[PDB]
Structure formats: structure tokens, C-alpha cells
Write a protein that binds this DNA or RNA. Structure first.
Ligand SMILES: C[S@@+](CC[C@H](N)C(=O)[O-])C[C@H]1O[C@@H](n2cnc3c(N)ncnc32)[C@H](O)[C@@H]1O
Ligand SMILES: [Zn+2]
Ligand SMILES: [Zn+2]
Ligand SMILES: [Zn+2]
Lengths: 86, 98, 109, 95, 222, 103, 82, 110, 97
DNA sequence: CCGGCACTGGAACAGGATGTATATATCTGACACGTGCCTGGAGACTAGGGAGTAATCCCCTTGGCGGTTAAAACGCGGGGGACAGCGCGTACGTGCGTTTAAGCGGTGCTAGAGCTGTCTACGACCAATTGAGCGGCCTCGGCACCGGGATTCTCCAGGGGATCGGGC
DNA sequence: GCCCGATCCCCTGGAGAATCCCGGTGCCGAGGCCGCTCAATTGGTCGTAGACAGCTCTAGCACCGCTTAAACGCACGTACGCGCTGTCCCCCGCGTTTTAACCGCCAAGGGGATTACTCCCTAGTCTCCAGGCACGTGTCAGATATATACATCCTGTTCCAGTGCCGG
């Protein structure tokens, strides 16, 4: 029954961890306010997918979010994902 | 006098380094603790598989890497080389999300 | 069964299972009656499509001097051909990376 | 127990040994080609269905499966694959 | 020389005479602003009124500001002051008696409606006797505002190459109207003036006896 | 000797803002029907020869073309205002389409 | 009986009207040859699918539902014709 | 047919045809079988989405001193509601025009 | 005359729901087609999502429970909280009597 | 009024330091192969209807013709907006010393996915019957267009009482 | 010293004036009223899909210890956002004359939508057998670290061009 309450984990997306994604995309010079907006952009994309994964799960009467609920939730938004079983 | 590389090169030569490897660029445990927490608002006491947390990391990375590709075109549109916070909102608003 | 068994994929000269395509069509709630020359036509297309994304992946994997094929070679053989890049436009390939590309304005002088 | 899980693995592997005899393929790569095929299949059949339903019919025939290709594959694929299919269909009858 | 100007039928609105008709609109061809119950001046001077920035006349029955919108400035008719004073050799001219501000609704310009053919006939008739026809303003085609026979106290408005007020063109209730506004705020006592352009049909024998540094020119040249 | 008194012409930016508020209130179609109809019949003459169009089939392409262009010119304007301008140039449409996805 | 040059029927004021409804205040002078190039490639991708939907039914008339289905195939649903 | 007839709409208390929705679910190739409370549920979610749009359409048609809903009011009805604009995001309503909106940096300053 | 064949629509149920929320207004002919098409377009989405739900789980039936989940997946935040209510009420009122 | 002992600016390339690459030992865990077994695909009939084929009827697509007139085309002026060039200073890139969790191996464990056996309520299927829904025919009237008095207001109108310049 | 025939601040006789009240008339489209026919309700029969109750076993959560790669501050100096000013040019508004879009007709025939009638092509059962999936296994392609070999980046000490400015 150990439900260790979680809090303020969005700060695990550090500053270098965002500079690396910006580099992979082709960005040369990064400003100083992008770091607080990329987290806000990510925490919104994540909800719209985890909500649908949990919905697909509740309908099958289970308790384990599986690796196909996520693939279906993504395919439902026009973001098909190859490689994890389809 | 430790040879002091000039600004604009240590970034320009790691651009061309991160565009040849295909690893994952975010930390595993710090990312996993976040997915498990966003999913407390929808149902208490959930359980994630091992391959369900790796299916979201790749989607998130492939979303951000292709948001920054479009940011880096608005910034060049305005005749700049840096990308401010007002470039991301234009990209999203033209795609159709905001 | 006086005659000997002859698979329905050899009558056509194919390698994809016309016997299994037909069943997946019938038991997939796509229509009431399923014709008899439909799976023979669909398998011939499925087999031609998977023999154009592999003829390019082989060539992409031989410029890195390798013998096996890994996901990176599929992303390279897909985003470098203008027809497959339009067919598989909104699709992510896990462990794919991105295409080497750096804008022409940021370069030094 | 551990009943089955069918896939197109042993056919994609057969097609590989025709275009590149001295070549292998990794597990991950295989699990991508499998999904590619499972995805194109129900993207083509899901159009033959709607065609047959728009014309108030009940049979999926070669004509529906062929038109569903010109509405899916772009440009030269739509012109190569169609000829690749009318060969198999022709050879099947004369057998 | 204490005589007075020849009589002119003082009038408050326009009168139709020729072959032209009226295009009175209904309460569906009038634009609607974005103001709202707000400070003392809704649709006011500084108020960012959509209609006021676009030179339209607000309407009391369609605007949300009720009836006190200060854009209704072609019915209140809160005009300038004391009439003809004496000038040197011009006819009479005019002047102001009460001070005004910058960009205020100075009096309108109102008279009779005449068409082009009646206009050419009237000027050619007035030309044989060389009566020196002077009152003839136009706005659009087949519609010319005349102030010769009758008009208002806007007819003795003097010309200059360095004016003080200007002649705009507003749209009031489906129709187009001409209203003169101020360039620069002035205390009471400077004779109001505005420039205008001409159209020569014969020759040019007129000079700008107004008085300024470059104002010599001609009655059709700046 | 004979002259007229013409009023001062509208300041630049008035007859362009009146139309913005006028056309954003009507609902008509904005391209001439016969010139748009000859164009369709010319374009479709490259796929199958000698075919016929229905009266409400030529009238359905026209209500989609307009809603495509009117929605493209709303996303061009934002790029122009982004680059600190007022005028939309030939290089705003390309960025609009590129970011949107069509190219 | 062939046709040609009819792309000049999308005239200059006809594009200014569409722009004004969009919301633009000033307009360059080379937009008029670039808009005719965006339009002529939106019409082809739709008339192609309309003619295909027609040929599949052995007809000779591009009816009004062919166009609606061809527009639905590209995520541009159109209400009010079927 | 030995008793008095009643429709299945009046049983649930709806105004949409529970008899016609069942037929479309059957003859449309959605699944091999169809439960018994699927049409009764699917019609009560269609009358609600229709009421929610016709009410806003009537409200926006009242505010032009008009008494009849025409295709412009349906456009102005969805484009201003934050959820219906998202349900009908990629949908064109024939002869609807657009929304009144001028960018705040184009207006003549002072 | 060949007695033209009947073609069905929701043009008389759209016209009955209107007189419950506005007892005096009307509706236009070219603006009834839009509501017809809206119903025909929303019915198909909510049915074609229940189809896939019942197929992922290896079932063979649409019930009053695939439709409830398809609605939660299709409708946005607040819409999908009164629609579920109206549904789960119009079935309780039907299974009772 | 243009120049000479000695001054002042403009250009470039080796020389390090770094970084990416060249060829090898070594090794290990994942890919490619048989092997045995089951279940799903192939062969042969039989019965019912969905679609191919021919012939009709009439809707409606395309084709001229003329006439009124609103929208497209063209050229002239004048001023606001796009673009280049300078100048100041603020914020981000780079390198280094250090603190803080991420990553990698064992170990335990138990919660829950997965699989199989009964069996019972629930939906497909058939016959019949009657009432709802669709096409067609009449309506009525709420509103667009005109008049008719005609009320509220002025306006052109010459005229009833002051006014006076001389008049008496 | 008083008075009178013409002459002006004011007035009102009609005429006008023009616009609110109120009333007819004529309609595209909508709103109701019957004849019809065929799809939805009722009532039963029947067979399979789905709901429970076990029962095995595996894989997700939780812990602990150790090493070291990555996050974090911190300082500097520099390339680059951002404001300002000047200039000129190209896009907008205002006329004039030209052209072809709209509208209202009449007119002849292509082909879309039905209907009747007779195949032949697919669903559906049995019967039988081989293709494909899980399991255990060997061995070799690719991933590490080591060492050395050139590309790239950056600068500072030599290297022409012209004169600093003073003058006779
Ligand atoms: C309104 S009238 C002026 C009549 C009279 N001079 C007055 O001011 O009362 C305008 C005419 O006066 C003539 N004019 C020319 N120069 C003038 C000036 N400087 N002041 C007044 N009128 C002038 C012009 O011919 C013009 O047609
Ligand atoms: Zn206002
Ligand atoms: Zn107002
Ligand atoms: Zn002057």
C-alpha cells in the first residue's frame, strides 16, 4: 500500500537536457527563456496522451497501462509509431 | 592562455554530432517519475509496463525535435539566429494546436 | 483430394500468403462478401511495397560498411526518397534519429 | 500456453534474400517492417470498404482493391504497383 | 462702404433640385462600433472608436453606448462664432470669436445639389456677364455641393496656401457629407482658412492675395 | 477664371480598412463564376477527356477554394506581423505552407 | 474546343477581395503571381480524386458527391451539399 | 401484434429514432452483433449535441433582430464556443464567412 | 410519373428538437442540410470508434459500454461530461419499464 | 605646393593544441538453423441471390443570342513604409572546480495478467400486421412596397403700428 | 413752437412642407392536410458468446551498495539584439474608357436512374494433410578499448602601402 506521494518532478527536464534536443533540431543559439516554456509545452502534450492511454486501459478492466494502449492513443491523434508492436 | 575556442564553434560542431547518433537524450529515471505523476490525476494506483514508459519517451523526443526544426525557421524569418519564446508560439499557432 | 496440395500463393508466383490475407479480409468486418481475386491482388501490392523500402535500406546500409540492417537505415531509406516520404509522412520510426541538415545562414565565413 | 502470435516475419525475410542475398536484419528492424505491413493492409482495405458502401454493393473485388490504390499511393507507386498486381491476377486465372 | 453681402437663404440642411435623388438608408446598412458603457466620452475624440477612426457617423439606435456617444456630431451642430469682419480688398471673409481645440468639429459645408450638365450650364450662363462665380464644391460624380444662391456661414471661408483648417469627407447615415476640421488648436481671434484645389476650363488670371511666404503661386497651383 | 473645389483625398489606410470590415461581414462568393468554371473544366481535361460536370459540382469546388485561400491569408498575416512589417510578401506564403505541412 | 490561359480569370481585384477578408492591410505586388500558383495545385489534387471516384462507378458526370468525398479524403470536410 | 404498439423512442423519452439508429448500426458493417442498448444510448447523445448547437444558433440569430436561422448563424455559433470549435476544427460550413477580427497592430495609431 | 423513391433524413427530428429550446423561431432550408450533415458525420465517428474498441479486445458486440467510451474519446472536456449523463439516464429510463 | 628620414596603417601562414580517424585484440550475446508438433489452409460438392445485360423515360447538361451595366483595366500623383547603416550595452557561450543524483548488479515478493471449465441469459432469425413517415396539394399570412390624409413646422408673404425729415 | 406722407422693428394669411400614422396589395418561401406502402413492433424458438470461479507463474515494485558521468555554480568578454536616422520607391487612391459577366429566353439530345430476367460466383460443410510457430543451439558481426595520423581552428610575428606633417 506504499503510495509515496510524488511532487514537482517536472524539473527533471534539466537545462542541458533541453539544449541537447535543441541541438539535434538544428539550433545554434538558445535564448534564456525557452527553458521555462519547453516544460510547459511538454506537460501539455503528455496529458493528452496519458489520458487516452488510461481510458483505453479502464475499458478492458485492468490495472496495468500496457505498451499497446500508448500506441493506440498516439495513432488516434495522427502520430503513428512504428517499432513497439502494431 | 588555454586556447580559448571562439564563440559559435563548440555549438556548431555538436549540432553535427547529435545528428548522427540515435540514442535518447533525456534521463530515464527523471522522465519516468514524471509520467507516473501526471497519471495520478486520472486514476489512483496505476502500474506501467516496462515497454510503456519507453514508448512515451520516443514520442516526446520526436515531437520536440520537430518543434525546434520549425522554431528555427521563424527565428531566421525575423532575421535573427537565436530562438526566443515568441517563436515557439507562432509555430504552434500556425500548425493549429494553440 | 486425388490431386496434390498446391498453395494459392504459388499459383500466382508470390511470396506473401494469399491464404492468410483472404482470412484477415473476411474476418475483419470490411464487407459481407469478399471476392476471389481480391487477395491475389492485395498480396501482390503488399509484396511490391516491402521490396522497395528494402532495396533502398540495403544500399543505405552498405555505405556504412555493414551487413545487418538496423532502424537508422530505414529512416535513411525513407526520408531520402520523395515518394515514401510522402506515403509515410506522419509516421515516427523508433530509434531513427534525424537527417543530417544544417541551415545555410548559420555557417561561418 | 504461449499459444501463438503470427506475423509476416518469414515472408519479409524471404523477400530480403531476393534483392540482397548477402544481408541480414536485426530484431528491431523486423519489428518495424511487421508494423509497416500491418499498417498498410488496413489502410488499403479500409478504403475498399467505403467504396463498396458508397456504390451500394456487397462484394470487395479486384476493381475496388485497385481503385483503393490510386487513392492511397502517390505518383509512380500508384503506376508501378497497379501493373504489379494485374500480373498476379492474370496468372492466377490461367492456372 | 457700409453695405452688406447680397442676401443668401440661410439653411441648415441640403436641398435637392436637379435630376438626382436621395439615398436615405435603413437601420441595416449602418456599421456597428465596438465601444461599450464606458467613460464620459464613449466613441469620443481620443476614444479608439472604430467608426471614428474610419470617418463614419455613429448612430443613436445601433451603438451600444446608448445615446450619449460623442460621435453624433452632425445633428448637434455646435458651430463657430462671430460673422464677417472687414478685410482689405477681398469680399468680406470671416473670423472666429470663441477659441477652439485641435481637431474639432468646425462647421459643416452645406448648400444645394447640382449635376454636371446643370453645372456647366450655370457656369457658362454666369460667365457671359463675368459675375465671377466663386461658390462650387464637388464630392463625387453627378453630385456637386453648391453654396452660391443659398448656404450657410461656411461659404465665406477664405483660401490660403498655409491653411488653418481642412476639408474632410465623412459618411453620415448612408450619405456622404463634408465637414471641416482643425489642423492646430487656435485661441479666439484668428481668421479661419483652408486650402482647396481648382479645375481650369479657360485660362488662369487669378492670384492668391492671402499672404504667406510661398503663397504667391496661382489659384490652382501650390 | 472658372474653377471647382474638390475636398482632400482619403489618407492611405482608410479605404483599405473599410473593406476589411465590410467583407468580414458578408457571406457571398468572391470570384467570378464563369471564369472560375472555365478553369475547372480546363484542369480536369488532363485526367479524362470529354466529361461533364454537375451544376452543384462546379459550385462545390468554389466554396472550398475560397475557404482555403481565406485561411491561408490569415496565417500569412501573422508571419508578416512577426517580421515587424505591415505588408505581406511572397516569402511569407512559403513559410506559412512549409510550417503548416503542405511542402 | 480545347482551353488554355484561363488561369488569368482569377484576376487582381479578385485576389485583393480574398485577402481583405483574410485581414491584410497592405499587399505586395508579386503576391498575384504566387497565389495563382497555390490555387492551381489545390484544384488538381481534388479533381484527380473526383475523377477517380467517378470512373469507378462507370459514369460520365462528376456529380456533387464525388467532390464531397474527395474533399473528405484530405481532412477538409464540407457541410451543405450531401 | 396482439397488444398496443409503442415505439422505442417514447420508452426512453427521446425524439430521435431508436428504430432507425439500430438499422444503421446493423447494416453498416461495424460488428458482427449489436447489443440492445446501443441505439438507445447513441440516440440520446445525438439529441444533446443537436440541442447544444441549435440553442447557440438561436441565441446568435436573436441578436440581429432576425427570427430565422440561416447558415451564417451556425458559423457564428460554433466559432465562438471553445469546445464546439474543437469538435468541428477541420470542417467548412458552406456560406458562413469568417469571424470579425482585425489585428491589434494594424489599427491607425493616434 | 414514376413516383420518385423515398430518401430519408433527420429533417423532421432536427425540426422537433428546435421547438423545445426556441418555441417560436424557424430554420432555413439550406441551413437544415448543414444539421443533417452534422448528424450524419457525428454518428459515423462515434460508431467507427466503438467498432475498433470492440475489435482490440477480441469481442464481437457493440454494447452500451463501448459507446460510452467512444464518447469520452471523441468529445472534448465539458461536452463529454453531460453526454455521458444523458446517455446513462436514457437507458435507465428504458430498462425500468 | 609638392616631398623626404622615419613614422603610420593594411595582409598573410606556420605552429601548436585540439579533435576526428586510421588499423587491431578480444569477446560476447543475438541471429540464423534444424526439430517436432498441431491447426488452419486446400480439395470437392451443393444451394440461393447479388450482380451483369438489354431496353425505356425523361431529367437536365450543354449551346446559342441579345441586352443592360457593373466590374476590370490603365495611367498619374504623392507620401508612407521597407531597407541599409551605426552605435550602444545586455545577455549568452565557453571553460573549470565541485556536488548530486543516474546507472548497474543482485535479491525478494507478491499482485495481477493469462488460461481453462461450465452454463446461462441474450441476440439473431421468421411470420404478420398496422401505424409512422414521405411526396404532393393548398393555403394563410407576415411582411416588402406604395399611397392618403395631415399634423407640426416653417416660410414667403405683403402688411398693422412706430419713425422721421422736414412741414406748417 | 405742433403735425404729416412716406418709411422700417415687428406680425401673420395663406401656402407650403414634409413627414408620422395608418392601410391596403403582392408575394418566394415556409406551415399544414391527406393517400400510400413498407419498415418497425410483437411474439416465440434456438444456439452461442460472454460472465464467473478457480489456478499457475512472471514480472513490476522496492531495497541496497558502489562507481563516475552528468548537473551545477561562477566568472569573463564578446558577438549580436534593438533602437535610431536617412532615403527612395513602390503600392494606394482617383479618375476614364473598355469588355465580358449576368440574366432571360428557346432548343435538341446524352445519359442517369429504373426494371425485368437469367446465369454463375461466393458462403458453407466435410475431409485431410503440410506449412508455420515455439524450443533449444552454435558461432560470428559488431561493440569495446589502445595507439597513432592527419584535418581543422585560432593566432601572432613578419610583411607591403602610404604618409606623419613639416617646409623651403
Ligand atoms: C468663397 S469665394 C470668396 C469671395 C470673397 N472674396 C470672400 O472672401 O468673401 C472664393 C473665390 O474667391 C476667389 N479668390 C481668389 N483668391 C482669394 C483670396 N485670397 N481670398 C478670397 N477669395 C479669393 C477665388 O476665385 C474663389 O473662387
Ligand atoms: Zn465607438
Ligand atoms: Zn457611438
Ligand atoms: Zn496663398
Amino acid at each position: 500500500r506504499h503510495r509515496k506521494v510524488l511532487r514537482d518532478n517536472i524539473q527533471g527536464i534539466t537545462k542541458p537536457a533541453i539544449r541537447r534536443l535543441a541541438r539535434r533540431g538544428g539550433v545554434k543559439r538558445i535564448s534564456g527563456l525557452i527553458y521555462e516554456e519547453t516544460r510547459g509545452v511538454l506537460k501539455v502534450f503528455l496529458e493528452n496522451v496519458i489520458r487516452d492511454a488510461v481510458t483505453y486501459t479502464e475499458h478492458a478492466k485492468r490495472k496495468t497501462v500496457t505498451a499497446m494502449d500508448v500506441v493506440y492513443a498516439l495513432k488516434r491523434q495522427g502520430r503513428t509509431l512504428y517499432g513497439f508492436g502494431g | 592562455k588555454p586556447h580559448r575556442y571562439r564563440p559559435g564553434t563548440v555549438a556548431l560542431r555538436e549540432i553535427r554530432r547529435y545528428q548522427k547518433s540515435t540514442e535518447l537524450l533525456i534521463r530515464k529515471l527523471p522522465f519516468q517519475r514524471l509520467v507516473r505523476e501526471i497519471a495520478q490525476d486520472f486514476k489512483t494506483d496505476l502500474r506501467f509496463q516496462s515497454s510503456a514508459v519507453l514508448a512515451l519517451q520516443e514520442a516526446s523526443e520526436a515531437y520536440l525535435v520537430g518543434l525546434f526544426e520549425d522554431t528555427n525557421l521563424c527565428g531566421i524569418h525575423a532575421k535573427r539566429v537565436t530562438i526566443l519564446p515568441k517563436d515557439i508560439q507562432l509555430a504552434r499557432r500556425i500548425r493549429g494546436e494553440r | 483430394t486425388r490431386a496434390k496440395a498446391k498453395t494459392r500463393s504459388s499459383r500466382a508466383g508470390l511470396q506473401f500468403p494469399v491464404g492468410r490475407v483472404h482470412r484477415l479480409l473476411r474476418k475483419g468486418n470490411y464487407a459481407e462478401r469478399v471476392g476471389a481475386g481480391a487477395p491475389v491482388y492485395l498480396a501482390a501490392v503488399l509484396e511490391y511495397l516491402t521490396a522497395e523500402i528494402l532495396e533502398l535500406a540495403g544500399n543505405a546500409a552498405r555505405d556504412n560498411k555493414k551487413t545487418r540492417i538496423i532502424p537508422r537505415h530505414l529512416q535513411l531509406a525513407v526520408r531520402n526518397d520523395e515518394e515514401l516520404n510522402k506515403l509515410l509522412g506522419r509516421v515516427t520510426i523508433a530509434q531513427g534519429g534525424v537527417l543530417p541538415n544544417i541551415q545555410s545562414v548559420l555557417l561561418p565565413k | 500456453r504461449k499459444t501463438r502470435k503470427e506475423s509476416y516475419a518469414i515472408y519479409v525475410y524471404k523477400v530480403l534474400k531476393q534483392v540482397h542475398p548477402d544481408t541480414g536484419i536485426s530484431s528491431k528492424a523486423m519489428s518495424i517492417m511487421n508494423s509497416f505491413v500491418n499498417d498498410v493492409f488496413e489502410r488499403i482495405a479500409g478504403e475498399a470498404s467505403r467504396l463498396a458502401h458508397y456504390n451500394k454493393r456487397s462484394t470487395i473485388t479486384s476493381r475496388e482493391i485497385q481503385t483503393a490504390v490510386r487513392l492511397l499511393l502517390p505518383g509512380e507507386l500508384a503506376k508501378h504497383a497497379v501493373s504489379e498486381g494485374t500480373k498476379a491476377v492474370t496468372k492466377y486465372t490461367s492456372a | 462702404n457700409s453695405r452688406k453681402p447680397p442676401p443668401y437663404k440661410h439653411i441648415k440642411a441640403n436641398k435637392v433640385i436637379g435630376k438626382v435623388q436621395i439615398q436615405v438608408a435603413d437601420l441595416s446598412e449602418i456599421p456597428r462600433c465596438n465601444c461599450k458603457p464606458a467613460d464620459e466620452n464613449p466613441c469620443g475624440l481620443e476614444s479608439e472608436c472604430l467608426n471614428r477612426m474610419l470617418q463614419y457617423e455613429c448612430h443613436p439606435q445601433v451603438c451600444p453606448a446608448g445615446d450619449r456617444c460623442q460621435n453624433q456630431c452632425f445633428t448637434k451642430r455646435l458651430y463657430p462664432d462671430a460673422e464677417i469682419i472687414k478685410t482689405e480688398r477681398r469680399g468680406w471673409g470671416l473670423r472666429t470669436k470663441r477659441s477652439i481645440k485641435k481637431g474639432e468639429f468646425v462647421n459643416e459645408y452645406v448648400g444645394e445639389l447640382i449635376d454636371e450638365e446643370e453645372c456647366r450650364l450655370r457656369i457658362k450662363r454666369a460667365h457671359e456677364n463675368s459675375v465671377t462665380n466663386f461658390y462650387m464644391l464637388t464630392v463625387t460624380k453627378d453630385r456637386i455641393i453648391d453654396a452660391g444662391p443659398k448656404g450657410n456661414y461656411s461659404r465665406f471661408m477664405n483660401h490660403s496656401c498655409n491653411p488653418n483648417c481642412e476639408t474632410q469627407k465623412w459618411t453620415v447615415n448612408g450619405d456622404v457629407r463634408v465637414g471641416l476640421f482643425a489642423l492646430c488648436d487656435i485661441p479666439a481671434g484668428m481668421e479661419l482658412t483652408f486650402n482647396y484645389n481648382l479645375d481650369c476650363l479657360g485660362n488662369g488670371r487669378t492670384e492668391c492675395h492671402c499672404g504667406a511666404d510661398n503663397c504667391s503661386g496661382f489659384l490652382g497651383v501650390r
